[PDB]
Amino acid sequence: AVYEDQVGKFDWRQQYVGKVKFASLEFSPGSKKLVVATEKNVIAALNSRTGEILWRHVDKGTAEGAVDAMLLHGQDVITVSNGGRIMRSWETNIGGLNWEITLDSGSFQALGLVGLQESVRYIAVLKKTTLALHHLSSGHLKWVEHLPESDSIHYQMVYSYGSGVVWALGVVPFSHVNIVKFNVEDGEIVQQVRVSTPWLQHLSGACGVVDEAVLVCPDPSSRSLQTLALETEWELRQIPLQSLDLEFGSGFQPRVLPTQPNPVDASRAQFFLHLSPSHYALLQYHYGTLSLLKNFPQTALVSFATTGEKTVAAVMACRNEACFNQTYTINLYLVETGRRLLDTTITFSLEQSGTRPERLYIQVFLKKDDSVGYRALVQTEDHLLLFLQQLAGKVVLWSREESLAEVVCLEMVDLPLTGAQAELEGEFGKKADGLLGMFLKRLSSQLILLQAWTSHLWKMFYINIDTLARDEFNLQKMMVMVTASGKLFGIESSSGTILWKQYLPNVKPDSSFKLMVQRTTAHFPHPPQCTLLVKDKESGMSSLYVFNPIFGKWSQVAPPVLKRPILQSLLLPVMDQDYAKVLLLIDDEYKVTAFPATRNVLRQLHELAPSIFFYLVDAEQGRLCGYRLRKDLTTELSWELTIPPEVQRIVKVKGKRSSEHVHSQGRVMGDRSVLYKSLNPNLLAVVTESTDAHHERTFIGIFLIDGVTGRIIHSSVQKKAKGPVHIVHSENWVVYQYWNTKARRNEFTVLELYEGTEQYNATAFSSLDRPQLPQVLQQSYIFPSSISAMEATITERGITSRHLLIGLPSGAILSLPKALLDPRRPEIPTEQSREENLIPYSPDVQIHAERFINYNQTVSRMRGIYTAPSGLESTCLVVAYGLDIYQTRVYPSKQFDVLKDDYDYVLISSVLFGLVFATMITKRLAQVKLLNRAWR
Amino acid sequence: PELLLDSNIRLWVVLPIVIITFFVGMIRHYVSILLQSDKKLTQEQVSDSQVLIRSRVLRENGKYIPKQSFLTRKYYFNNPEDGFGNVTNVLPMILIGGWINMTFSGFVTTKVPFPLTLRFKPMLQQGIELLTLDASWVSSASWYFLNVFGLRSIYSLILGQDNAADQPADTNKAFKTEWEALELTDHQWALDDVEEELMAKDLHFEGMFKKELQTSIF
């Protein structure tokens, strides 16, 4: 921003983290922290009192930043990431870093923590070939050993305790299983044991270790459990469940959940058994005997915790039933004996219709009355985090909507016209009777206006969805956000408060979304209407969803059923009798479907068919096609182009925004002459990248084509260049950025189109009647940074100057004037250049901190920038969405339309009064002087 | 129309310019009257000026006296006689223009109701920085100058005569000039045929014995 005074008056930022993958809550707990890691390769520490962020670290967005393993120890966190390559020790208290090291090659299998003599001092890392022990204080390697027979035996588990030895377990499915015991002090292979299991196939996700290092696995085929004491046994012991009278589910994988609160001592003798979906059993093992401590049928989730010497389990289920009211209850149980702890039940509910929780993490503490209080952290199905406490009316402490970290679409709809004036339109300015009526009603209106004015001055000394009304300047709108998880949000654009929410069931992670505003709020008897198109990635099925932009409720009009995959869509400007723009969909069989398919719309399309064209681009084969609509809503092939994929591949295709207006139809270079622009409204810019990745044979191709006929207006190739490419194509120009390898720098390139000196036709623009190619001017510049996003500002009439908003990787957003990137700038200054007032060419563009539109509200991992006109000729609304969301407003031309906020009324009144006083005094003095001069 | 304007700018930027320029003009007029001048002339100057005026009046109206008197006066005047402040007026205009440009420029003020050409644009848009805006829209300084120029008639009307706005050498030389000018004048009596003109018609005794003889005051 500017002036350091409007800070926080117009802009706002919201920060987010991705979907939780690992969490850790056990702490002092005098310090209130919650260390979390998400699926967006980001690790953060959230405050538990409120839910804010204390510190956050963001890694690479690609697969080279995924977190593989996470552990906690005292006040430190240990992370293994980058496909089992990098290990880090985060200091939780300050948010810095203790150390970071690189492991050897291989695939990560498991991470463990070991110790000796009641003191943990080492970290154990397991890879498909080797096992390594490193120091914990400094991270220096202690030793590495090679797992025997690693070629065929897949090692999957690591277990140890304060004894002084370390086990490693490997399996071959339906085959022998091997256990190798090493010693911590030096690292010799001191024991090896082999057994045969022709019935199991997995070890990591099904087996467990309980008590004094006793392995336990389930077997549904044999309908029993198998146990082996790793210390003093070399044969499996089978135990049937008919004694405890259980039953494994059909076609389900049972699980064993042990616990080990302290890595030094042995594990607890009690463990959970996940038997069937929503079926658990808390059992206790003692010398080859299993005791049914408790069973839990029809339960949702279970979890463990431990404080001091008390180990406590937490069970979450639902009351009535596909639960009835989406209402769930959480209860606390003692682990030593199956027993509820009274006065511990927590009841909560979910607002959405078809959601359900998936994770449960519990933090426990000891109360003053020697009781066990606790709090829970619940993640739902739609990426919603809730922090529940143990109160009565404040069961929910705080919540976070983490689905807003993957926004894929965005629209702005202006609020409906104020009811006090929308309905006043009918009663005001309405013809009633002859010449004697309108003036009488006008004077009555003036009288009531006077009464209102008197009422307003009498009191000088004495957010709801249905009360929303638009501002006089229309500077407040209704943001509509669509998230990759399948959730729609309706948010106020002035303070960023969620006004409504909606959920779409069964949305695949990699679908394709596209929404268009059909009907706005300019027709009171009809409701505003928006449409959303969702296409499945794999099956190819496509669906439509019609809703209200203001309230979020589904509309009564049922959208049609798309029996064929949808190839593309189009939004005509033709309005039905209900003022709804007609939408066309072209499917896989090249026949179009209209919506709404009313009789009037059908007749209009029957009349206007030969003036609508479709163009389709296939990047896999590099084939472009163009069809023309026929009378009966059928299509016929018109033009076709091919680009060989073995040399180039298409990466982008850009067209001009359909809601923009160009003000001037020509440019004046002086000396009483005009240079006319070539404003083709159907031009397409296509960017292709070479398939040769060598640093001396790579290039980027640019094609300017006509969408109707298919003429290639322009072809160009830039050599020694590499992607990614960011391109902006606007009213008359194209600006694209790239990376140059011979000099290793980022470069801008600007192309500008001009016509001759006389207009070919000033009445219309038909693409079938333009037989003369335009004139292309090109230039290039050097940009000393990288780019994460690019966009161009918009305005109502296109009178203000055009600026480019550029999103850098650091987080800032730069506003670069377009007049700086002009191909007509001369290298050698001349008199004509002076009379045109053109700056001489300079090869470098500089970045200044004063040009940032966000002072320090940085946006991390930026992905999109959106601009809106906002019903005023000097202000544009900007929304930048990446991991974070930022909203502000910009004035390219210093806001010539609204009076400055620093107007000094007092000075104006004082100067007016002084002028009046001086006038009076001077008049008196002049009169007296004349009178005295008359009388000598 | 094209643009949407805030009513506050109309309420607080338009009227003050007019009020300020009006009262500045009035103050300038009154101050100019206050210290207009103070001139003093010696006796010889006024005496010679009155003599010159008398000679001019003789030359102009010698045709209403008998020729002998005219030539008697013409024998005279030939042998014996002929031969023997702003700084405050202009500087405050520029100063006030500069002050107004300093403390008011930066927004659109108003629009003229008739179309213009591109020639008008550089004059009426001193403050704004747009490029393709029409020439009808004006800035604050142009409005101030227009208001200044369009008040001469109002000042002449509401104030006495005309003000509050911007726009002998040698006695002997004058004596010689009047001597040369008078020498070529000759008497032409205007009473030669007055009687015949009188005798043409009866006297106009109509509308003379109306009303009534006055009795007292009022």
Binding site: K514, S569, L570, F614, L616, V617, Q665, R672, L679, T763 | -
Partner: peptide, 24 residues
């Protein structure tokens, strides 16, 4: 006498409509 009347040149209008892009 050119370079004038330019501000009075109202823009023309489209004759066709086209939309699409990469396959959805």
């Amino acid at each position: 006498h050119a370079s004038d009347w330019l501000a009075f040149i109202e823009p023309p209008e489209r004759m066709e409509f086209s939309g699409g892009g990469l396959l959805l």
